[PDB]
Amino acid sequence: TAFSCCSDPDPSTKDFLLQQTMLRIKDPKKSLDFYTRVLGLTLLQKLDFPAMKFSLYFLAYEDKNDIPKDKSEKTAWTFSRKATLELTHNWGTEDDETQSYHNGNSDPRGFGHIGIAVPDVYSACKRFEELGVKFVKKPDDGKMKGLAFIQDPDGYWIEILNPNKIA
Amino acid sequence: SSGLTDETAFSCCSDPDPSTKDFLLQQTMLRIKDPKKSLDFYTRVLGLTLLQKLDFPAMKFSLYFLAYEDKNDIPKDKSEKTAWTFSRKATLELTHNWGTEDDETQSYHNGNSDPRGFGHIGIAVPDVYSACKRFEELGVKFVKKPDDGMKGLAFIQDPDGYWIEILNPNKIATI
């Protein structure tokens, strides 16, 4: 409401940037295929933590030729990119048929979705269909047309939107 | 369990289809109990700018779009404003279902306890210790202080208990 929005944030925050959104993923083989092949993201970096039994995969809309190859240069670059998706893999969940993650849209709710802006929701979704992508909401379904939701291999919801046709 | 080799992981990566060339990662949506508390936290404490507020009286919810953007860049015309808001990179979408603020029975799940899923958003800052010193002075609740545990990396909580990572890209290459 009216007073809650600070319009003159302290200058010590002026260089803060929204660097990542982290989601836990059961199987990086499926997740990496989906985010790179279907949605066109690039894998920036894979970090492994043997002592803690997990790996991190950082994906973003970045040109792979921009990514430094030396692992130390790569690390500083990856963490200074805007809008990365951090996928956390706890070792062994792929081979654990008892295990799966919660997408936040049913009890208990919290997290809702990530969202990707695209030039053409209908063409993009037509391609998603041809690729066998699972839909939550097709662009025509529901009546808030021209907006879609698809699901990644863990069942997380991804909004597919056009900024001009939201209006 | 041993985790993927680099070779396995990279072999599951395809190059992007040219039809996705202009796709951008636009938003992360979180549900929020109290918009007064949340907007104060994200604008005043973390310095994001509220790009736009949308109200849907028929359905009894509101949306808040926040981002690290120059407030002077926001268009005045509401058609211009919506297309600009929705084409900004890395925005935070906060969804408020009306009335949750004054229901002491209600709260949202931050994803970090059973059943797990979502973990956090993360903000890169010039100096984690300086940022956290201010957070401490502003009464921010911490999950992990930078000195405690992986020094130089922190986690704080927003008013719903969502975890927010505080990191310095120039020092994270040190564990």
Ligand SMILES: O=c1cc(-c2ccccc2)oc2cc(O)c(O)c(O)c12
């Ligand atoms: O409920 C929503 C309604 C509208 C909307 C915006 C402009 C004109 C008409 C409808 O946009 C949205 C965008 C989102 O990213 C989202 O998660 C949403 O739930 C909505």
Ligand SMILES: O=c1cc(-c2ccccc2)oc2cc(O)c(O)c(O)c12
């Ligand atoms: O466990 C983590 C370890 C490291 C790390 C990075 C460089 C050198 C040493 C350790 O970075 C992280 C970054 C994140 O965004 C995150 O959610 C994490 O859990 C970690």
Ligand SMILES: [Zn+2]
């Ligand atoms: Zn993280």
Ligand SMILES: [Zn+2]
């Ligand atoms: Zn959304």
